[PDB]
Amino acid sequence: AEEFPVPNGFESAYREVDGVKLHYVKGGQGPLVMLVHGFGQTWYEWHQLMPELAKRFTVIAPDLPGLGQSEPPKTGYSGEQVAVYLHKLARQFSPDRPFDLVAHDIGIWNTYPMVVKNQADIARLVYMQAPIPDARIYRFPAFTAQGESLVWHFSFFAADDRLAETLIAGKERFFLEHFIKSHASNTEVFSERLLDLYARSYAKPHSLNASFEYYRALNESVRQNAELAKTRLQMPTMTLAGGGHGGMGTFQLEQMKAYAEDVEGHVLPGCGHWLPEECAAPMNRLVIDFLSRGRH
Amino acid sequence: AEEFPVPNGFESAYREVDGVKLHYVKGGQGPLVMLVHGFGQTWYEWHQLMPELAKRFTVIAPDLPGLGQSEPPKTGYSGEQVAVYLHKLARQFSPDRPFDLVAHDIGIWNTYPMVVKNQADIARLVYMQAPIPDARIYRFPAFTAQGESLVWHFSFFAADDRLAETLIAGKERFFLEHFIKSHASNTEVFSERLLDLYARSYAKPHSLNASFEYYRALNESVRQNAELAKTRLQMPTMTLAGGGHGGMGTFQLEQMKAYAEDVEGHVLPGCGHWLPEECAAPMNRLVIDFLSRGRH
């Protein structure tokens, strides 16, 4: 039983990677583009971009380990550990050619180590709406003059005693709707049905836990990246960020400038965190144009 | 009924103040000292200090509006609104003489306005383990290199949609044990028996809501205090802070120096947020000695 509807011309499938069964949705022909979702969501956040991209590329959108229909990782949830699964999955489908990577939210955390360690495998890179884990995350404020901050969830989700699972169980739909809307500019794009679909997926007990284990590993990911970042990224990179409520603003590009030699950035006015859904059309156009400057 | 055992020789009573029935515990003889508790607790956090102070002072320990056995406020939960209730309560028992004040956590928020607006009524002041609400609170980090930060709960509790009550209702005893121990150094003093007593009190629906309304008013309290702080406090003041896990460290004294002409500060090693329980012997001694410099 599929958790989300598969677009016409795409297939829902599974591959075993290092003993972990990963779910993905795949379609199209041409060079490979891997799209990696973030917290609260699954492969389905890419379902509007995928058919357009499939006109020029082979597109694969996996569920992160433990989320959606993917098994939890057997190593751990730190960025370097999870990136192995995603790198090896992509290499099964693009063994002889570099591939493109698009990532949203914790999809960044779970891909940056394999990008920096396997640069010859990455043709072009698109990152949106999350910091690469580094010491800059320790500067975000706990509280603001307008109320709750954008990043206090880092501490809530990383707390021990299974604090987040214990408080959210039985309230999974309520919490996710609040989380999405508090990080959105355009809340109208989140229909009842769409919120229902995402809530049912991450409410699976192993997926609810998996969601927060990414944050319980966040400081380990920071420490990992402190060593990895001694090597700059050399491939063409684009950053996207919202300019409205929930958006990262100039932070996304300004951080990426410290990591990448060849980077262009855009801030989208009137958009918040959930760019593929809040601002699907301009985000799709910018990704498609950026990736189509390469061979396709 | 009594939610907590009253020390021998003290009385548990109520007084209507501006239409709000406040609960308090009172005993002793001599000049008045009012002890004001904070979040997660009630007057009972003072129950070991109270018999010692009552040898030299009349001691009153009220429950904050909405918490313990006190009715919710009728005006609002901002510091300036709540301080009216506490000032009028104290002056019922000390109408012609200044009184002393000791406050912990949001007890500071709920007393600072009446101290600065009625300085001749306050003989000596002791503040512990909370910032006075001002712009400094917007600089605390959401996430730290050790993990969850001191004050991410500011945003959790202030979030709209009754986020905190909706998640914590039915899980109050679980949440309070996590909150107290995560802000403690000497965690072993929080026996299951003691946690049971505190949890039963703040699980009253109006008390759970009242608890978070103090945080929903925090930005208003900041705006109030930006005007009030144009006049410094002139009376002798002492600050206490924990130096261990959960403690405010040097921040407590360093902020108070901006507010008070005459201030001495102490950081208690191996002590976190809950000074009366984690570090009863040194904290009680510091408070008794400081207040006993005045007539008693």
Q: Where are the domains of chain B?
A: 9-292
Calculate ∠ Cα B127-B84-B9, nearest 5°.
65
CA distance B107 to B122: 15
Determine contact, residues A67/A4, Cβ cutoff 8 Å.
no
Characterize A84-96 residue by residue with b for buried, 16 or more Cβ atoms within 10 angstroms of its Cβ, and e for exposed.
Answer: bbbbebbbeebee
Task: Kindly report the number of other CB atoms within 10 A of residue A18's CB atom.
Answer: 12
Cβ neighbors of B267 (< 8 A, separation 6 or more) are: B241, B242, B243, B247, B249, B250, B252, B253
Contact A187/B at CB under 8 A: no
CA distance A106 to A130: 7
Q: Within the 156-185 window of chain B, which residues sit less than 8 Å (CB to CB) from chain A?
A: 156, 158-161, 163, 166-168, 171, 174-175, 178, 182
Least CB–CB distance from A166: residue in B142, B152, B174: B174
CA distance B178 to A181: 27
Give, for B263, the enclosing helix (H) or strand (E): strand B263-268
Nearest CA in chain B to A173: B167
CA distance B44 to B37: 8
Strands A20-28 and A122-128, by their bridges, are unpaired
What is the three-class DSSP state of B199?
helix
Tokens matching residue A37: 């979702």
Query: Which fold, A9-292?
Result: Rossmann fold (3.40.50)
Technique of determination = X-ray
Q: What phi and psi, each to the nearest 5 degrees, are found at residue A278?
A: -65, -35
How would you write chain A as a 3-class SS string? CCCCCCCCCCEEEEEEECCEEEEEEEEECCCEEEEECCCCCCHHHHCCHHHHHCCCCEEEEECCCCCCCCCCCCCCCCHHHHHHHHHHHHHHHCCCCCEEEEEECHHHHCCHHHHHHCHHHEEEEEEECCCCCCHHHHHCECEECCEECCCCHHHHHHCCCCHHHHHHCCCHHHHHHHHHHHCCCCHHHCCHHHHHHHHHHHHCHHHHHHHHHHHHCHHHHHHHHHHHCCCCECCCEEEEEECCCCCCCCHHHHHHHHHECCEEEEEECCCCCCHHHHCHHHHHHHHHHHHHCCCC
CA distance A69 to B209: 38
- Its sign, for the CA torsion B52, B54, B57, B58, is positive
Nearest to B66 by CA among B77, B80, B78, B51: B77
Nearest to A61 by CA among A109, A26, A11, A18: A26
Calculate ∠ Cα B204-B205-B211, nearest 5°.
85
Q: Within the 204-243 window of chain A, which residues sit less than 8 Å (CB to CB) from chain B?
A: 218-219, 222
Q: What is the Cα Rg of chain B in Å?
A: 18
Given an 8 Å threshold on Cβ–Cβ distance, is A140 in contact with B139? no
Burial class (CB in 10 A: 0-12, 13-18, 19+), B11: exposed
Least CB–CB distance from A155: residue in B142, B159, B163: B142
Given an 8 Å threshold on Cβ–Cβ distance, is B152 in contact with A152? yes
Contacts with B155 from chain A: Cβ below 8 Å:
142-144, 147-149, 152
Nearest CA in chain A to B145: A219
CA distance A63 to A36: 7
E strand residue ranges, B105-253:
122-128, 143-144, 147-148, 237-242
Nearest CA in chain A to B172: A167
Tokens matching residue A224: 């990992």
Of the CA atoms within 13 Å of residue B195, those in its CB half-sphere come to: 16
| Dihedral-angle region of residue B101 (phi above 0 means left; psi in -120 to 50 means alpha; beta otherwise) | beta
